[PDB]
């Protein structure tokens, strides 16, 4: 049984998660545009820059975020952007979302200058997580939880973050006990994704440097979030 003080949190969070979506102007390109390593990379860039925007808006609305040291807020945004993006894309492929054009989107990612050493793990992650049959609420809570990770590098007050994250973890667990009483390991299975997600940050920074020396174009927003001269 979910409490009233908790059912309100989940509602506020589920509310912000569904507030903004990605522009049809952007998502229509996955379908309409030419399939070129160049065009592919540019569409992927456009989507990521845009999502960095939705991420800030979403995070800002997270309960207690705007109260943390402002230098800690940047560290949390800078540290979760890639992971939040893996979760959102995995959700897209997993729920075969219409505005996601999964097959074509996968095409564009499969040919954008990404090393095979990275694509394999990326899609394997997409597959295994899809097989979890996650509910929009699990995606939304794993995202908020990923965003409020106290153990990110350069965090000053790591205790203030834990205080913001623990309430969310509990709501997620309370749900796994309700909608999955048969399978008790479901909660622990969802948290395992937080570790797998971590794993991609090393790979991503490699890619950023690879694309960079190849004179690949990013955006002032992405360069800032991902510390790229």
């Amino acid at each position: 049984e979910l409490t009233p003080d908790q059912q309100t949190l989940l509602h506020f969070i589920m509310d912000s998660y569904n507030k903004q979506r990605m522009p049809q102007e952007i998502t229509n390109k996955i379908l309409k545009e030419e399939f070129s390593a160049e065009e592919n990379f540019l569409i992927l860039t456009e989507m990521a820059t845009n999502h960095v925007q939705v991420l800030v808006e979403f995070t800002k609305k997270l309960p207690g975020f705007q109260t943390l040291d402002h230098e800690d807020q940047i560290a949390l945004l800078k540290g979760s952007a890639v992971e939040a993006m893996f979760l959102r894309s995995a959700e897209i492929f997993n729920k075969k979302l219409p505005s996601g054009h999964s097959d074509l989107l996968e095409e564009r990612i499969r040919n954008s200058g990404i090393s095979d050493e990275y694509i394999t793990p990326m899609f394997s992650f997409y597959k295994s997580i899809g097989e979890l049959k996650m509910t929009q609420e699990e995606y939304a809570l794993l995202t908020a939880i990923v965003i409020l990770s106290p153990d990110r590098q350069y965090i000053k007050d790591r205790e203030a973050v834990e205080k913001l994250q623990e309430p969310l973890l509990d709501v997620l667990q309370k749900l796994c006990k309700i909608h999955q009483p048969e399978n008790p390991q479901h909660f622990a299975c969802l948290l395992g994704r937080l570790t797998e997600l971590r794993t991609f940050n090393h790979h991503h920074a490699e890619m950023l440097m690879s694309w960079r020396v190849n004179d690949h174009k990013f955006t002032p927003l992405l360069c800032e979030i991902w510390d790229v001269q």
Partner: peptide, 11 residues
């Protein structure tokens, strides 16, 4: 430092 993130956080 971090002009753009700082700006999005104040908007």
């Amino acid at each position: 430092d971090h002009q753009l993130l700082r700006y999005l956080l104040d908007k």
